[PDB]
């Protein structure tokens, strides 16, 4: 395999000008300062940038890059995208299941993983967890060895590494690059970009492409880079790192002065006399949804302290609410305590559904890398993560609250009233979580979407029916009560519970109320708030929460589909 | 000035063993790997560690280090502790005002600053803001030049720099160290510790102290460090950085093998034959409170988008609440709307006082550095920041809410009822902010104290009197209503507003109520909640909020006084 790129003019501002050179099979490196082209040429050569800005051609063996190029070449991210809560065996099985074909037997795929994990030297850590904040795991020198193996499953002919040594120690970074030089003798063209290497690193290369401010300033063998700048008019002292010497020339011991020296070289004309020699899904939907939902569930189990901790809070707060509101009375205080516990239960399900912001935000760089590499669709990534994370973690507190507090408080002792309350708390937990995903999908910070959820809740909670009476608001504000999730949950719990209730002891007021302004029955309270007494007045509130799940999970789908993937 | 340390055994685990050496006036450097002693020896030599673990002696010119050593030597933090919202002129005036004596004239101090700012080369940026997230400021290469000047005001004989090049670029880091070599010829002993230098850096040194895993592995002139390891049995190839060569030996191209080679040297015995030659507040309280409160107020003005943004939210939410609750009626819905707007106003003052967590947390590393250096006391730092940040930012929304919503809603149209409401909203804003400082003082992360404030508020807000009736709770829980800030604010606003009110139109019920269970006057509502109708029943709530300000601002003072400063 030989890359051969020619006359690239990428634009967003033209931050690349014209870069030429071939990349033979060996150990190729792209050096230079940070703001130059060392990170932009690599994303052009690996098709990780938008082709609307690309101008020149990139050729492989005389044939252009097809649409199958992103699946047949491995790109390795700078920071680790490995699942730290799965093991090294399990991370390579997920990559093997969604990239290899479905024809291969599980006996065939497990031997392909055993060839990779033996080649990398991960035999002693093959069944150890990679590591999280809450889990002691494999060290950072072998998280980088793991992520190389997730890209070697399909046996690519071309590897693209993005800063393979940034973030590692000095003794670690030689162990990664001595692994890569053994890979380069197998015939795999390795193309990477190192931030400020050392001479123990620089002595191993086979080609060098030096870039600064979008200008090609050297391309050729890396051994001849020192003798080139000596013959340009510069001098390297003794005991100096040559890779430190090259960026010293960039900063002025100018750019248009030194780029024109490369045009008049014997290296540019030899490259120019080579480029003219050459020029002149995979997987079904149900298999992608099976493995996305399987890995997302092991993550939910392998992180107990954000999953167990929400069940402990639900049980403890369910017992504190059951003790403060222990058995409710049918007296003058009985309307206040029932309307106050049902207001606390619906606005707890809303504010505790702010943790759904974290679902699509933490996994953003792993969604973008795996979508371009071609593991899954957006549709099976979206449905497979709703099925595994959002669905069981929002059913369980809605059951635990209702089982604890219903018989301590002494709510309406019927069997159908028990399950309407469990179902109403469950729809208000989904509708508030779908709203959190409709805001957080696509973003990369948590703190702005967390604040915007909280601002929207405190306006939905004025219009819920406890603080202001909704029949008294002016007609040009009163249409805003239709846009609020705690209104529909608190109307359906109040309708469920206040029906056959009397609240004036010694006064039968359901046949006639003597001396009004009294509120002696639960229908009088419920009409005074503006709630319909028909059985459609209950289930109007559930078809309005179900229509907000479908709208908010479609906005959350289109924000991942229309995302900037490049 | 010559430092001369001898046989240091620091313990928390003995992570230093025995380190010897003198430091003559020049440009001294402390290299090695990160976990070794390069960061721990510097904090011992500058008295920035606890003397309970220190064993050996540190001597200056034959005299031990006094308690005046931290005031007569300059220590420079790694990351910038400069106020990015003040200018370079203003940051040096704050350091000159609290470190120089009060005898000196302002004409004398401004010439001392003009000597410093001309020596550093900050003439073109002398009146430019240093820079924040919201302000375009001076670049990071001259934030480091500024912070050196904040320590050169008292003209110290000994400078201690902590990583003077980590975080800077390669062209920048030579400009800082060429500044330091000009300082070293004036007679200032410069003692620093660089993470992985370059040969353009290494060629400038005058002494070298190489440390790894708490063991002294070289101390002598930095030119002779290369010839020492050649004679130890190692070989440096051509074009290799010698500073990269030294940490290559540490990692194994062992520690107890290579530390014993230094004991048998001609450099250790020459050091050993030198140590036995030698061996054998300032400022008043009112001046510290003047300048702490002055800088903390310029920060409040120079950051408008966290100060103006809380006034915009107060005006906008004050108009939204005034439109939903526009003029209140004395009908059956009148009790609900008055008890709901007064519950929203007190629990808004609590949850918007979570931004007081940010007060003592963001300024933590600048409090610890300036307390050890001896600028101010803990008492004048605490009072000078309550006076400047907490006091005016919690008066203003309590005035803006009360001026907007009082006459739109049509609350009790008396002059004393207008100012009791303004004063009750102001005491509940201080008491919730003092509670936020009593939790956040001493901590260094925001997100744990922000969550712990929010958990405590939602339990204080059940016990406030709207959700559960406080006369109905069991006697073994009902003592918890005394520990809640929204209870005392919402009882004092309900007492203020529900006194002379009638709520049943056509029914005079203040002489006698025909047909009870009615709640036709505001005293009947107010006794039913458990509120005393005497004028002490109003002001009991304000002496209970004033006693929680004094308790929570004493817990917040003792958490800064008893903090681990080392």
């Amino acid at each position, epitope marked *: 395999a030989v890359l051969s790129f020619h006359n690239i003019c990428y634009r967003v501002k033209e931050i690349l000008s014209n870069i030429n050179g071939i990349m033979k099979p060996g150990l190729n490196a792209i050096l230079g300062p940070t703001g130059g082209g060392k990170s932009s040429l690599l994303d052009v050569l690996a098709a990780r940038k938008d082709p609307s800005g690309l101008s020149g051609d990139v050729l492989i063996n005389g044939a252009p890059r097809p649409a199958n190029f992103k699946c047949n070449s491995g790109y390795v991210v700078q920071d680790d995208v490995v699942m730290g809560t799965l093991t090294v065996r399990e991370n390579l099985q997920f990559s093997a299941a969604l990239r290899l074909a479905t024809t291969m037997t599980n006996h065939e795929k497990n031997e392909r993983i055993n060839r990779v994990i033996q080649e990398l030297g991960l035999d002693k850590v093959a069944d150890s967890k990679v590591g999280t904040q809450f889990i002691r795991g494999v060290s950072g020198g072998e998280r980088k060895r793991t992520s190389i193996g997730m890209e070697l499953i399909t046996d690519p002919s071309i590897l693209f590494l993005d800063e393979p040594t940034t973030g590692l120690d000095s003794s670690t970074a030689n162990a990664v690059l001595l692994l890569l030089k053994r890979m380069s003798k197998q015939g795999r063209t390795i193309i990477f970009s190192i931030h400020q290497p050392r001479y123990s690193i620089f002595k191993l290369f086979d080609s060098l492409t030096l870039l600064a401010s979008g200008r090609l300033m050297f391309h050729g063998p890396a051994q001849e880079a020192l003798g080139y700048f000596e013959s340009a008019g510069y001098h390297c002292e003794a005991y100096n790192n040559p890779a430190d010497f090259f960026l010293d020339i960039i900063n002025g011991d100018l750019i248009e002065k030194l780029a024109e020296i490369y045009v008049n070289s014997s290296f540019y004309k030899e490259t120019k006399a080579e480029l003219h020699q050459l020029s002149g899904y995979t997987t079904s939907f149900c298999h992608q949804l099976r493995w996305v939902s399987k890995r997302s569930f092991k993550n939910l189990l392998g992180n107990p302290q954000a999953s167990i901790a929400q069940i402990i809070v639900t049980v403890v707060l369910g017992l504190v609410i059951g003790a403060i509101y222990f058995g409710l009375k049918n007296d003058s205080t009985g309307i206040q305590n029932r309307a106050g516990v049902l207001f606390f239960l619906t606005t707890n399900q809303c504010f505790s559904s702010v943790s759904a912001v974290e679902l699509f935000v933490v996994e953003k760089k792993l969604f973008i890398h795996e979508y371009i590499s071609g593991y899954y669709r957006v549709s099976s990534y979206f449905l497979g993560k709703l099925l595994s994370d959002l669905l069981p973690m929002r059913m369980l507190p809605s059951i635990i609250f209702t089982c604890i507090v219903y018989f301590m408080l002494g709510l309406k002792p019927k069997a159908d009233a028990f399950f309407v309350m469990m179902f109403t708390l469950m729809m208000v937990a989904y509708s508030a979580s779908s709203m959190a995903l409709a805001i957080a999908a696509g973003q990369s910070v948590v703190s702005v979407a967390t604040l915007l959820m909280t601002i929207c809740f405190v306006f939905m909670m004025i219009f819920s029916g406890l603080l202001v009476n909704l029949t008294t608001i002016a007609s040009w504000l009163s249409w805003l009560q239709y846009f609020s999730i705690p209104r529909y949950g608190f109307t359906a719990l109040q309708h469920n519970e206040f029906l056959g209730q009397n609240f004036c002891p010694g006064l039968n007021a359901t*046949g*006639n*109320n*003597p*001396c*009004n*302004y009294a509120t002696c029955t639960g*229908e*009088e309270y419920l*009409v005074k708030q503006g709630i319909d*007494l028909s059985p459609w007045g209950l289930w109007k509130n559930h078809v309005a929460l179900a229509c907000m799940i479908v709208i908010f999970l479609t906005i959350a789908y289109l924000k991942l589909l229309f995302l900037k993937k490049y | 000035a010559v430092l001369s340390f001898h046989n240091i055994c620091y313990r928390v685990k003995e992570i230093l063993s025995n380190i010897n050496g003198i430091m003559k006036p020049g440009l001294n450097a402390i290299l090695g790997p990160t976990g070794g002693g390069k960061s721990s020896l510097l904090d011992v030599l500058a008295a920035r560690k606890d003397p309970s673990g220190l064993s050996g002696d540190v001597l200056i010119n034959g005299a031990p280090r006094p308690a005046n050593f931290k005031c007569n030597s300059g220590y420079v933090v790694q990351d910038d502790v400069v106020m990015g919202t003040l200018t370079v002129r203003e940051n040096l005036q704050f350091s000159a005002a609290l470190r120089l004596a009060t005898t000196m004239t302002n004409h004398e101090k401004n010439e001392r600053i003009n000597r410093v700012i001309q020596e550093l080369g900050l003439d073109k940026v002398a009146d430019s803001k240093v820079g924040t997230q919201f302000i375009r400021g001076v670049s990071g290469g001259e934030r480091k030049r500024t912070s050196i000047g904040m320590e050169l005001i008292t003209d110290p004989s000994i400078l201690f720099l902590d990583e003077p090049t980590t975080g800077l670029d390669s062209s920048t880091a030579n400009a800082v160290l060429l500044l330091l070599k000009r300082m070293s010829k004036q007679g200032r002993t410069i003692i620093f510790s660089i993470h992985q230098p370059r040969y353009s850096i290494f060629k400038l040194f005058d002494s070298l102290t190489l440390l790894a895993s708490g063991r002294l592995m070289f101390h002598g002139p930095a030119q002779e460090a290369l010839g020492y390891f050649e004679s130890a049995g190692y070989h440096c190839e051509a074009y290799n950085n010698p500073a990269d060569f030294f940490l290559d030996i540490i990692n194994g191209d062992l520690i107890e093998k290579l530390a014993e080679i230094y004991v048998n040297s001609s450099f250790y015995k020459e050091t050993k034959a030198e140590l036995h030659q030698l061996s054998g507040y300032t400022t008043s309280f009112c001046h510290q409170l003047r300048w702490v409160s002055k800088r903390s107020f310029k920060n409040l003005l120079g950051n408008p988008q966290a100060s103006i943004a809380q006034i915009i939210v107060t005006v906008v939410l004050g108009l939204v609440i005034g439109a939903i609750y526009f003029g209140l*009626k*004395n*009908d059956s819905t009148g009790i609900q709307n008055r008890a709901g707007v007064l519950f929203f106003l007190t629990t808004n003052q609590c949850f918007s006082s979570v931004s007081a967590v940010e007060l003592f947390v963001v300024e933590k590393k600048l409090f610890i550095h300036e307390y050890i250096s001896g600028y101010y006391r803990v008492s004048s730092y605490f009072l000078g920041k309550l006076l400047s940040d907490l006091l005016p930012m919690r008066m203003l929304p309590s005035i803006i809410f009360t001026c907007i919503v009082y006459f739109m809603l049509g609350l009790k149209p008396k002059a004393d009822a207008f100012f009791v409401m303004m004063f009750t909203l102001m005491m509940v804003a201080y008491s919730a902010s003092s509670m936020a400082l009593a939790i956040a003082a001493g901590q260094s992360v925001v997100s744990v104290a922000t969550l712990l404030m929010t958990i405590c508020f939602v339990f204080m807000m059940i016990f406030s009197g709207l959700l559960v009736n406080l006369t109905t709770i069991a006697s073994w829980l009902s003592w918890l209503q005394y520990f809640s800030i929204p209870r005392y604010g919402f009882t004092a606003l309900q007492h203020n507003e529900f006194l002379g009110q*009638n709520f*049943c*139109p*056509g*029914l*005079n019920a203040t002489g006698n109520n*025909p*047909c009870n269970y009615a709640t036709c006057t505001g005293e009947e509502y107010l006794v039913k909640q458990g509120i005393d109708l005497s004028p002490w029943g109003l002001w009991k709530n304000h002496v209970a909020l004033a006693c929680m300000i004094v308790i929570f601002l004493t817990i917040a003072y003792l958490k800064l006084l008893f903090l681990k400063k080392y």
Partner: antibody, heavy 118, light 107 residues
Framework: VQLQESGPGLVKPSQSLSLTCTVT?????????WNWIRQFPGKKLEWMGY???????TYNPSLRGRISITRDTSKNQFFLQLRSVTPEDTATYYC????????????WGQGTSVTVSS | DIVLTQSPSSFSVSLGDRVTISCKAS??????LAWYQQKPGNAPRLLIS???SLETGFPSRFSGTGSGKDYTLSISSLQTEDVGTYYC?????????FGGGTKLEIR
């Protein structure tokens, strides 16, 4: 307990209409609410608004800005002031009494007819 | 608001006969319904309060039996002194509305 309307029985269009109901046998500042009801030709009753025993007032939203009810507690009178009068509201105006605890318009006036013509 | 409908706008009965007047509301009134009788040339007079109770000064031939939104007035064995116009008022919500009125006649 004993109510009696009085006022001009004819009024020019778009000026103002004033009535007066003098209550005997009861004090208007003591207990009830005191209101005005009109009955159109082609008889349909229509409530206009009340003044409370404590001076508070409440009006019908279909009569927006045009109605105001005042009282004179020195001699037990309450007043109807209906301004910018159309020739459509040539009704019969009544003053009545609202018990509050019972909820119904218990006592009624005699009724005076107002014709709005030119 | 709440509009009140008396769809039988007239009747035609004889003496000793039972007649029934219906009143329909556009909202839940919760027995806050009153009935009025207006002789020709007089103010209306309260007949029933609270949709069931009867006022002191009326025979026990009138009765109201309503619930929810359907309320009704029954005049069993009417005399000559019972011909008039019958109105229904709600006093639940704050703009108190009346019904259209129904005018009894004698065949």
């Amino acid at each position: 307990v004993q109510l009696q309307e009085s006022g001009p029985g004819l009024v020019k269009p778009s000026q103002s209409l004033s009535l007066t109901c003098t209550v005997t046998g009861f004090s208007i500042t003591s207990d009830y609410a005191w209101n005005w009801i009109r009955q159109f030709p082609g008889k349909k009753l229509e409530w206009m608004g009340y003044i409370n025993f404590d001076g508070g007032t409440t009006y019908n939203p279909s009569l927006r800005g045009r109605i105001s009810i005042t009282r004179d507690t020195s001699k037990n009178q309450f007043f109807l002031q209906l301004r910018s009068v159309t020739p459509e509201d040539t009704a019969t105006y009544y003053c009545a009494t609202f018990y509050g605890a019972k909820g119904t318009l218990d006592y009624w006036g005699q009724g005076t007819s107002v014709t709005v013509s030119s | 608001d709440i509009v009140l409908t008396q769809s039988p706008s007239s009747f035609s009965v004889s003496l000793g006969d039972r007649v029934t007047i219906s009143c329909k509301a556009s909202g839940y009134i919760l027995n806050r319904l009153a009935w009025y009788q207006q002789k020709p040339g007089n103010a209306p007079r309260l007949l029933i309060s609270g949709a069931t109770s009867l006022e002191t000064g009326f025979p026990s031939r009138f009765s109201g039996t309503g619930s929810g939104k359907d309320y009704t007035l029954s005049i069993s064995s009417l005399q000559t002194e019972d011909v008039g116009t019958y109105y229904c008022q709600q006093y639940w919500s704050t703009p108190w509305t009346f019904g259209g009125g129904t005018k009894l006649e004698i065949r």
